[PDB]
Amino acid sequence: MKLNSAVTASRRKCRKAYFTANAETRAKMMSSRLSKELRAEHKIKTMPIRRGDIVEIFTGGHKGTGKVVEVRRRDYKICVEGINQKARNPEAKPVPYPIHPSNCIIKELYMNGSRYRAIKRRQERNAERLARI
Amino acid sequence: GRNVAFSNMRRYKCTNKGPNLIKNWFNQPA
C-alpha cells in the first residue's frame, strides 16, 4: 500500500493528471515493452515510443507489425503503418487506426544519438538499484 | 414541560454573522 502522503490515490486527481499531463510526462506515459531480443541488448524493460520504431501489436483488434509514423500525444495513441481502417472506396487516402502504445511490443528502435545516451543513463541507474542499493 | 429544571444555557450569539463564536476540534489529532 502506498506510504507516501504526497502521492494521491484520488481517482479524480489521478485522472486529472492523466488527461492534463505535460508533454514530457505524456511521453513517458506512452512507453512500450522492448522486445525480448531488444530487452537483452539494451538491458531495460520498456522504452518511450518514438517515430520510426517498429512495433508488433499483441492486442486482437487491428493486430499486425509496422513502423510508427505518427505519435498522437493528445489522445495517447500511436499510428502504426499497415494498421488502417477499411476504406469506403478503393481510391481513397488511408485512415490510420490509432493504437495504444501499451498494446504493442517494440521490435526495433530508431536509435539516433540522444536515445543511445538515454538508454545508457537508465541502465546506469538500473545498475545502482540492481546492486541492492 | 411539567417538572423540569430550568435550563441555564445562554442563547447562541453571533450564530450566522459577526465573530465566529464556535470552535471545532478536528485539528486535535493533528
Place this chain on the structure above:
Amino acid sequence: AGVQCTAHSWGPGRAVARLPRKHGGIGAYANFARGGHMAHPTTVIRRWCRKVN
C-alpha cells in the same frame, strides 16, 4: 449555498406563490426552489465521534 442570491417575496397580489423570487421572478431561497438552501443545511457541528469507557 442558496443564500448568495438576492430574492424577496414578490408579494400577495401578483397571482404567484409567496415564496422568495429573484428580480426576473424566479423561485429562490427555499428548500422547494431550484437553487434554494437546504431546509436544514448539514453542519460539521454534528458530533462525529462518540465516547466509550
Place this chain on the structure above:
Amino acid sequence: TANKTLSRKLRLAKKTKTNKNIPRWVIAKDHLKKTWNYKRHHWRRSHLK
C-alpha cells in the same frame, strides 16, 4: 455622435473589430463543435456602454 471624443471612439472601434465569428480553421484546429461566438453584438438589439 458625429462629434465624438477619441477615447469614446476607440472603445467603440474595438467592439466593431471583435464582433466577428470564429475563424473556420480555428473550428478545425480546436475541434470546437460550438461555432457561435456568444460575445457577438447587433447594433439594433444590443446596447454597448
Place this chain on the structure above:
Amino acid sequence: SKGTASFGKRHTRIHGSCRRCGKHSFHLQKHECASCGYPSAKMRRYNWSYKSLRRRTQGTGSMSHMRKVYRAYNSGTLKANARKYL
C-alpha cells in the same frame, strides 16, 4: 405620460466610462464613479455586497507582479534577502 411618453426624452448620457475601472458608472455631472469611487484615492468597497467584492478584487485580473514575486519567493529571493540582511 409617466411611462412611454416620458421615456422618449431619454437622450442624455448620465454616466460615462471610469478611467480606473472602465465601468459605465462615472457620473458626468457629479464627476464621481459609482463603483471605482474615482476621483478618490481609495476604492469603493462595501462589506454589504460580497458579490460586488468578488466582481473586481485581487485575482480578477492578470496579477503579473504578484504572481512573479510569489513564484520567486518559493525559489531564490528569500536567499538574496538573507544576503542583503548581512
Place this chain on the structure above:
Amino acid sequence: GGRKRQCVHGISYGKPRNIGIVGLKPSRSLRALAEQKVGRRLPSLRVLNSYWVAQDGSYKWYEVILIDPFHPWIRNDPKINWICNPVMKRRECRGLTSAGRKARGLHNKGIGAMKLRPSKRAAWKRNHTRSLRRYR
C-alpha cells in the same frame, strides 16, 4: 469639551436609550486624540509618547514625540531600534501609545481588568466561544 453625535437634525431614531446627542463624553482622552491627529498629518513617523504642554478654556495643547524609523542613527541605536520594526507602524491607530492604553483599560490590572486583557473584544470572543470538542 464633550462630544455631539453626528446625527442629522439631532435625531438618533430607534430605541430611546440610544437617543441623546449633546453632552456625550469621548471614550479617548484628548491626549490620545492629539496623538491620533499628528499620526494622520505625518504617517511617515512613528509616535512614541505625548505630554501636556498648556491649556485654555477653548483648547488644550499636547506635544508628541515622533521618531523617523528610517534614519541611520535611529536604526543603528539599540535603544530606539524597536520603533523601526514594521509591527510598530502607526501605533496610535491601534491604541498602543500610553494614552490609548489608558482608554482601553490596560493601565488597570487584576480584578476590574480581567475582561479587558488580550483585548475587550478578544475576551468576549474567548468567553462566548462554544468549544464543541471531539470527545465531548
Place this chain on the structure above:
Amino acid sequence: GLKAKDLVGLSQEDLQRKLADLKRELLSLRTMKATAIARFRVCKKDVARVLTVINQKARDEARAAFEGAEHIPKTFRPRLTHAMRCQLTEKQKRLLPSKLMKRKLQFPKLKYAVK
C-alpha cells in the same frame, strides 16, 4: 533565424545598423502582406533578439559604471520586496545595549545533561 550567440560579440554600432535593416525588412514584409510568410515571423523575432542583445550590453556597461558608487540607479538595485527593502539588517536587529551584551558574555550559554 538569427541566434543571440552570434550577435553578442558585435559592435553596438553594428547591432544598431542590423536593427535598422531588420526593421526595414519588417516594413517590406508588412507591405507585401497587405498589398497581396515564414520570413515575417522570423524577422519579428530577429528584431527582438538584436534588441535584447543591444539592451543587455548597455545595461551591463551601465551597471558596471555605477557599480561601486554610493546611491546606484534604482534599475541596478537588488530585487527584494518593498517589505524586505525597508526591513532591519540582522546586524541592526541583533544589536543589544552594552550592558545587556556584557551580561551575555558574563553568563555564557552552556551544555549540560541531567541524570
Place this chain on the structure above:
RNA sequence: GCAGAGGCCCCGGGGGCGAAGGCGGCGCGCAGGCCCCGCCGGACCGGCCUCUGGUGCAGAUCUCGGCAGCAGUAGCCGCUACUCCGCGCCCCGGAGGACUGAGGGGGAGACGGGUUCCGCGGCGCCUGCAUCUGGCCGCGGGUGACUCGGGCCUAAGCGGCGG
C-alpha cells in the same frame, strides 16, 4: 422501500454467454413491495448481518422544465392605391393612375445609437404574408481641414487654497 459504510457470500458473490435502467407480461405477499420472464439497453450490480442519513410525495396561488385542449381559433382593419406589360418577387424597369402637400412620407444638422454607410455575393436566421427585397447574412472597402467645429475664453455653477 431508498442511498451510502463495515463485514459475509466453501476454491471465493452475480455480470459483453449481457450490469443498471426502460417497456410489456406472470407469479408471490393482507399490504408497503418483491421476484422472475420476454424485448430494448450496453457496464456495472447486489442478497443477508452490523452501521449511517439531505431516506418514500398528489396537493403547498409549490419550484424548475416539458407541454396539451381551446385551435387552424382570436388576430394579421392608422397613415386614401394600386394596375398593365417586361425573366417578373411585394424586387427592378417602362407606362398609367395616385398619395405625403414647403409646420412635407422633402432636403439637412444637434443628441443618442455605433457600422446601421458603400459595393458585390446570398436567402440558413430575421423581414409578424411572401421575397429573387432589405435596415438581415457572408466577403471586401469607407470618414482627408491654417480658414468648419472641438481645443481657447468666460456664464450659472464646480473645484482648488497656509489653514
Place this chain on the structure above:
RNA sequence: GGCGGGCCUGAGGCGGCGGGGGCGACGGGCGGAACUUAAGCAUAUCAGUACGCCCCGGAGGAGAAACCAACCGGGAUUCCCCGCUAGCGGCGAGCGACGCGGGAGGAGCCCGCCCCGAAGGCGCGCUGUGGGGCCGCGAGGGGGCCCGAGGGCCCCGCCCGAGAGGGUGCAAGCCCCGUACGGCGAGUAGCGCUGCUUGAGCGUGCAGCGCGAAGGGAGGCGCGGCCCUUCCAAGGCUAAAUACGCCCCGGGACCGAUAGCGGACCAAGUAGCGCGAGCGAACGGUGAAAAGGACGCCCUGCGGCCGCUCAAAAGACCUGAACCCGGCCGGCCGCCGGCCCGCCGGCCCCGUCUCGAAACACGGACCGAGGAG
C-alpha cells in the same frame, strides 16, 4: 539712527531616504444600529453584534505585578480543560466573570531619575550624545475458447519491502505509468458633578469639566479611625504556546448535473438586464476508432431512395420514461363486484380547515424531477 556677526524663530530651493494605495480571513483602534426576546412595551435583550471608518503583521494584541489572595500561600503574558457560580436584572425575559486546581508553553529586561559629562551615532549635541528541498531507478504471463475489442472464462504459472491507484477496445499485481525499497514617572492619581460601559452590586473600565496631591495603591458594602497582608501607577521593549482566508498540498460513511459553489460545458461573474448602486442565467456525455456517412438510381435543384462505415447507427448524437400526438389494427369506452365480457347491481371531487363540504368554501389543466421535525 543706520550697517555686520552670534543666537533664536521662521521662509524658498536642492540632495539622499521614507509615506500614500491593494487583500470577503485572522488581528488591533473607533463610531455604531435595528429587526428580535420580553408572548404588549419604554429599562433590559438582541449586542459591547451587523455595518461604516482607521491601522498593522505573519500572526496580531497581551506581557514581566501600584497582581492574586488570606494559605502548612502563590508569582509576566497568551492559550486549552474545569466550576458555572459569585453576581447583575421592570431581581422580569434574560444575562454572567474570576481566583484555586490540571495542562500547552515558558524569558527576560530597559529608560527617566541618579552619577560622569562630549570620552558620543561628533555639519549634530552641554535645553545632554555616550557610558555607568531536489533528483532518480523501479519486479513479474503464457496457452486454449469466444468477442467488435478481454481487462471474460478455462487450465496452468510468476513477482511482492511493490495486491495504493490511474491508463489501456470488456472486470489487469505480471501491457504501460506508477507504487514499496533510495541517493544528493504631576494638570498626573484621586475626588466632586455628568455621560458611556461592566456580572462589578453607595461604581467595573472609560471619558468631559471643575479641583487637584505626596509617600502612594489594593485587599470584591459605602464613611471615619487604628492595624495587618501585599504591591509600586501616572514612561518603554519582548519569543513561545494561540488564530486564520486567498493560494498550494493531501484526505473524505460528502454531492452527482433542477444536486454540488451562482459557475463540471475552449470563452461564468460570462450572455443578458438595470441611468446607477447592482442583478445575473441556461447549457455535461457519438464511438473503441471520425472510421462523420461508399456507390448507384431519382430529382431544376434541395432533397428522396438504395444502402454504406460500425459490434451497433450510436448519424449529432449513450439510455430514451411520462404528458401529449400521428399511421395501422381491435373496442364503445369511468371505478368496485358477479359472470366470457356487455349486461345487471353498487358508487358525488379529492386535499383541507370545519358542528357539518359534492358544495354556489378554498387549492388543484397535465406530466416529470426537486420539495417540509
Place this chain on the structure above:
RNA sequence: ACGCCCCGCCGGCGGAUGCCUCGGCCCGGGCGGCGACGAAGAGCGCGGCGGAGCGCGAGACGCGGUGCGGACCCGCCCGCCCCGAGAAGCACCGAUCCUCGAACGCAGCGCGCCCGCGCCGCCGCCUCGGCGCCUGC
C-alpha cells in the same frame, strides 16, 4: 366520421431514469511571499492565417541566459530531423514592459515650462527674513 378506450404494432415530441464525471463541498496541513524600483485593478494593442478565453506588451500568442528533456509541432502551413544539430515539454534567472490607475508638469486625451518638471515627512546643505534676544561700528 369525430371523440375517447387501448387489443396489439410502429413512428414522432420531450428529456426523465440509469450509468458515468479533468467540477463542487467539507476537513486537515503548509504558506503568509504586493506596492512611487509603479501594486491591485482597468483600457487598448499583440498570433502567418485570429472571434472569445489564457498569456504577453510596439522586443507583444513573446525574447535572452543556465540547466534538464529528447521528436515532434491540434487545422493548412512552416520549422525540425543527424552522439547534438535540438520539436513538444520543464524549472530558474535576466530584461522588455503602451494608456489609465496610490498615479506624480497641468489636465483627460487636450496644453505648458525647461533642457527633466507632483505632494507630505525626516536628515543634511545652500540662499535670506524678523522694531525676537543681543553685540560691535
